[model samples]
Target: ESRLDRILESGVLRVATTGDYKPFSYRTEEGGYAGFDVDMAQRLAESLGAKLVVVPTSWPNLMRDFADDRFDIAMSGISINLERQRQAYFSIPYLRDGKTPITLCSEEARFQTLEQIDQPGVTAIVNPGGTNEKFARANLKKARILVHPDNVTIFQQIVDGKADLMMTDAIEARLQSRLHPELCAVHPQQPFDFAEKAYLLPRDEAFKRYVDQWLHIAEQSGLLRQRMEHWLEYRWPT
Candidate 1:
């Protein structure tokens, strides 16, 4: 039976998430999940008349867990990449984004380009086992790359001068910059590279089609944009 068939028959839709990325998927203080993607997962479950079950996964082990049948789909703010597409299918992209540098506000002028930021003395901090680390390693040969274990506090390291900067998704850079006035997102609207964020699913055509259609309708109905605006303006509790 198709994965869609199973989901419908079983009355449960399992969605995986890292629960670390802000505005997308994050664990709340009360030990519950909340975010834009979490809300979308709930809607998707409702569409299928199934109960939504959020499965916690880590960035480093995301693919391994997917391979082990950990969930029916991953609805985190997951980026689309060739490596990930090799084993799974991605729903149509919901957002266009790319890597950009976020550094101390005063240091913005000094790190507007890759050449400038990759200098010998510069240090770039990245969360381990994610696209941010991959982008940093691929582009910064001369700079020191610090692999930080916590995504939540990685940006603070930049603010505290523990690291000079961080190359991350432009959307995240913008959010962090707003949250930490000490930092600034450098040219977030015109990032260095191109990427898109989409939900991760197994290689199941029926399920993929259903997801893509649902997303298309959401976009057409302006629900996607509406939700995005709310999250973009949301200030996480300190």
Candidate 2:
């Protein structure tokens, strides 16, 4: 079987993605997917010689889709973990940066460490799924969690006083801080080390060998990283 040409044969590369990761795959005002992950996925599809067919899916439902092959692949700065690695094959870590916590612009002194944010009356808001929710659930202690029913509302909660802090991927947080004056990132660091964000395909992958080879080549070619920086407006496109 020409597994490398699977997507080409199918005439589509079904990609499940988040719709509210700000600069990493949010819906544009123009109603199109645009962001760092959207950018990276497109580049990968170009290299695969296949037309990208994006399937916008919710974070809560991302794993279910990937598990069921609802999409050929999923990309949105997903972190690789042992549990996930058991269920899916993942791309090499694409970005070293991850979610950093933040609070209202005027409340910089609220907490210096992730530990302090657990105190009662201290709340942290994050999008419902992805590493944002995972990280918040694992680290924020007993703090009240503000879950936005959708991607955009997560940020809205922070600005509307419904949430105290926003714990999100550094990539999204950086863009959001620029987009809103009400939010300010205080913790420049993560509480612990984390896997670099990457993409995922199902476990027992038929796509592993081919996808890995392509991704490795892309990594060295400065292809994926360049695309990431491009969407963030951090670097001029190559």
Candidate 3:
């Protein structure tokens, strides 16, 4: 018996998400979840002949909830990183991502360099849990850091002058800045680190193998590229 077998037998694909990450998974104004990952989850469930049960989660609680069996998989624009790899299996990367700084357009020059923003007075606001928090913890030693619970409002901290900048995924930086006219995403260097996006799964190798195959088919069939383009171009974060 394999993990896939269990999911097929149960006829339910339990997917977890913080539901605040834009262009990935977030609450729809129509009183449901919508985004790229949501679509992926639906498609995955369809492929498995299962129903997708979306479980609400938060960044700080994601790992613990996953470990505790709160959900069978994590798929809300999750990043592939070392800490996650040690505890959970990740499918082959579907997207490449990296942290980029978003600030008021006026401050772009001032905060272009990483060292410039990592100064004593520069406030770098980040949402708790997830890779953004990890990046802040690992890199923003000299900067003043604040943990904001809402990923949606955290960027406003910089816009409102409460913080200098916020470091977030490049996809988000672009999506957000487009919505907030005052904000702009600045890429000073290549990126502090390159990250990959993938679904967070359990420790079962068979399950991981099935997911990898799914992703491979999705890519080769052009579904992944088509979805990304639609979300990035047609959709606005707000």
Candidate 4:
């Protein structure tokens, strides 16, 4: 039997995610997972006639965890980076995003350009997982880079003046600004680099084919877009 067949037989769809990304997958204070990814994982499990099993994960360990077969799929704000392509298969793109700045609204003009940001004493706080860290390492030459461990608290570093910048996904940057009055997303529509969000799967052709087709239908039928809008609005329906 194939991997899909095994999952069907077991009747459980295991999903991996670091529940720290807002509007994607985040842990609620009520001790439940909620967000677009959680919703999608549930729908997918239902479609396959399986129980949904959420496997808590961390960003720095995503690649290693997936490689170790820790979960069947990974779907909490995963970026479609070229390096990941070498290690695993990715579903068709669901959303287009990019790496951009979440800075103090007061420093918008001062930190507008890359040249200005890549200067001495301009500190950037980044999570040690995913593209944010990769972007900072690649571009911010003169800035003091801090690899933060907690994704939820990375923005607070800015508010406390511990860091001056954070380059994260466009959607996240926008959502964060609403939560932190001192923050604002800079040029979300036109980020410094292009990145698309997609589901991560193991290297199984049959599984990959099934998911790609499923996502294609989700996109065509508008359910995907609808769910995305719901999450973007920050509404968690019980």
Candidate 5:
């Protein structure tokens, strides 16, 4: 049976999220997930006439969890990449984003380019097992790469001068720069590379088709942009 049929019959829509990326997905203090993707997940559940069940998954185990059939879909701020496409399907991309650096506001000029950032003595902190880590490892041969477990607190490490900078999605770089006044995003408008944000789904054509249609309507109706603006302006409590 198609996952869509199973989902409708079960009356539960299982959506996986990393819940660490702000403005996209974040685990709230009350133990509930919140963010733009979380909102979209709720809307998707309603469309399926199913209850939304937020499943917690980590970047390190995201593929493993998905392969294990732990959830029907993943709506985190996941970037659409060929490596992921090998095993799962991605809905039409909703946002265009790419990797850029976020560093101390005072030192932004120093780390603007890949050559400048990959020099020896520079430390780039990144969360383990995600695109950021992959970008750093693949690009930075001379710089020290520090793998941090907590994505939420990783910026603070940079603030405290533990790391010189972090390369992440341009959108995240922009958002985190707002959260930490001492930090600045390095030319987010023109990132180092190109990437797109989309929802992760199984290989079921039926389910993927439905999700793509639903997302298409959301994008055309301006709802996606509205929600994105709201979260972009929202500040997480300190």
Candidate 6:
């Protein structure tokens, strides 16, 4: 049921993502998309000798687009969740989110924990389609939620007081916090562990096989993790 034969034959990989997702897939000041996901998509494209063309999409429909014959693969900070699994297939996880909170600044005095973060009027921001959004919905329902188009805005929301707290995959948090002082990653009461984010494709067996083998090579060659951590974070304790 895989449609990868067509993909393999064409040597072009259409990568799905919201073009503005930062530390993952955001349009850069350079007038081009830049981030962990963008880099990963390019790397895989290069490895496959395939042209990686990004397919832009929005939230809620990001998944639905894949279902409606829109794109071949989605690599935007795509978190693995049960609902998504029912709709499309995913490869192995490439990265995971932080389970702990880090202060917005080393000197900031306010204490941060999941308990304090959920207070009403306290807004939490998160990257859409990843663990941060999922965590916010599940735990911070009482608080207002800011679902920015991408991470740059998500972090900016907290800086502007539009939101009070936020969480994201560890690599992204580490990459983004340098530019914004008010954005702090709150360490969790327990590691809010979840499946590492992964690339997704249609459930067709052919397409699945292509990415599965490619993922293995990407992992074994250290190509995948290296791309994410090089400009991002170097903590791949796995």
The per-candidate count of clashes, in order, stands at 0, 0, 0, 0, 0, 16
Root-mean-square deviation of every model: 0.8, 3.3, 1.5, 2.0, 0.8, 4.3
Residue-level lDDT of model 1, residues 135-229, one tens digit each, is 99899989999999888888889988899999999999999998888999999989999999999999999999999999999999999999988
Residue-by-residue lDDT tens digits, candidate 6, 1-238? 3456666678988998876545577754665677777877887787677899888886667877988878888988777888889888898777666544433564233535566666777666666765567777887757787777655556666666675556666555555566565555544434456556788878877677767787888889987777766646432211
- Computed on alpha carbons, the lDDT of every model, listed in order, comes to 0.93, 0.72, 0.86, 0.88, 0.93, 0.68
Candidate 3 segments exceeding 4 Å error: none
Show where candidate 4 strays beyond 4 Å: 235-238
> Which of the two, 4 or 5, has more lDDT?
5
2 against 5, candidate with superior lDDT = 5
Q: Estimate each model's TM-score.
A: 0.98, 0.87, 0.95, 0.96, 0.98, 0.82
C-alpha RMSD (angstroms) for model 1: 0.8
Clashes by residue pair, model 3: none
Which pairs of residues collide in model 4? none
Instruction: Tell me the TM-score of model 4.
Output: 0.96
Residue 119 shift from truth in candidate 4, angstroms: 0.3
Question: Residues 1-238, candidate 2, lDDT per residue (tens digit)?
Answer: 5444668677677888876665667765677777777776787788777788888788788778777678878886677777677677786676777667666788767766677788878888777766777887888768888777776767667778888887766666666676677877665565344557778875535576666777788789987677766777742111
Q: For candidate 1, what is the lDDT?
A: 0.93
Residue 127 alpha-carbon offset, candidate 5, angstroms: 0.4
Order of models, best lDDT first = 5, 1, 4, 3, 2, 6
lDDT of 5 by residue, 1-238 (tens): 7999999999999999998999889997789988899999999999999999999999999999999999999999999888899999999999998999999999999998998999989999999997888899999999999999999899999999999999999898888888899999999999999999999999999999999999999999999999999989886743
